[PDB]
Ligand binder design. Structure first.
Ligand code: BEF
Ligand code: MN
Length: 128
């Protein structure tokens, strides 16, 4: 994918945002911004330019499922890639996110290889 693709990395824990940003950097993606919850995320998204969202689920203010649903329903960003990265591992969590339009889903804790694999699966699905 285009190494200038702009990522938004959303999680309420700075440690996990830092993991994901550093992993993206290794993969060659440096156009990366962070958000602390779904509301913060939507403010950045409204500012424009983003081409990929990686998001946690459990967050205050607006959780990641609500964030995914909002993005998918919004005519300006309905096809935005959204990779869910969450500790939630139950099949019913995975179903809810998948049905809501998740582009992919990674369970925490995850390896560097898993993130790269699941990112590439999305790129290839979307022809990026
Ligand atoms: F808080 Be996340 F869903 F890991
Ligand atoms: Mn969280």
């Amino acid at each position: 994918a285009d190494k200038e693709l702009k990522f938004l990395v959303v999680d309420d824990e700075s440690t996990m945002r830092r993991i994901v940003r550093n992993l993206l950097k290794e993969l060659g993606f440096n156009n990366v911004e962070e958000a602390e919850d779904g509301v913060d995320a939507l403010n950045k998204l409204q500012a424009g330019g983003y081409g990929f969202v990686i998001s946690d689920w459990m967050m205050p203010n607006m959780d990641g499922l609500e964030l995914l649903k909002t993005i998918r329903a919004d005519g300006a960003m309905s096809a935005l890639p959204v990779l869910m990265v969450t500790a939630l591992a139950k099949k019913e969590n995975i179903i809810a996110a998948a049905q809501a339009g998740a582009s992919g889903y990674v369970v925490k804790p995850f390896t560097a290889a898993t993130l790269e694999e699941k990112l590439n699966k999305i790129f290839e699905k979307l022809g990026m």
